[PDB]
Symmetry: C2
Subunit: 112 residues, 2 copies
């Protein structure tokens, strides 16, 4: 069991993220890390709404090891410091977890 995280930073700013494999896999040591991923995942989507007045493009489910995509491409708000500052903390949170448990987590970043 492994969680896959891919961020997309276009010209210096975070645009989207496409996490997969979280949303449990009854494997405790893993489910632990999944909780972690999901906590950070939903907080972003929430804090971005509540605190940044940004309603991101969300897509999700907990089927076959869950899949969740958060897009900001179709939004001319993504450049708001408050949006970007929050997205950066999410990248900083996912990044540390994939380096603390490279066994369970993988964080990639495509720059363009």
């Amino acid at each position: 069991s492994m969680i896959q995280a891919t961020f997309i930073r276009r010209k210096g700013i975070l645009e989207s993220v496409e996490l997969t494999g979280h949303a449990g896999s009854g494997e405790y040591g893993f489910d632990i890390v999944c909780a972690a991923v999901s906590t950070l995942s939903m907080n972003l989507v929430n804090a971005l709404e509540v605190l940044a007045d940004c309603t991101v493009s969300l897509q999700m489910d907990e089927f076959d090891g869950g899949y969740m995509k958060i897009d900001l491409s179709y939004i001319t708000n993504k450049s708001d410091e408050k949006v970007q500052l929050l997205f950066e903390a999410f990248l900083l949170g996912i990044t540390n977890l994939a380096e603390n448990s490279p066994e369970f987590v993988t964080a990639k970043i495509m720059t363009q």
Copy 2:
């Protein structure tokens, strides 16, 4: 048994300055741990995001023992009123808030202002 983590937020003058976390570390069963893993992540993230992105260093304090004890404090950090610092903190308050809402039996949070 008696599995409960509490988030005590103090807000002095419109801005958050500290928060205390006790019990979030250690066991209680499976579902409890999951919550602990969630609080500890949001908690460790705030400390890291504040130092790295927020240019603000924080007074930390923890004893893995006795349920676990966290105390992220900003009462004496010059830039504590700084808006970057406050946004990241606000969101930490939002995360901890829903997490306590979704799992009332494992997490409790209060905000007492001064």
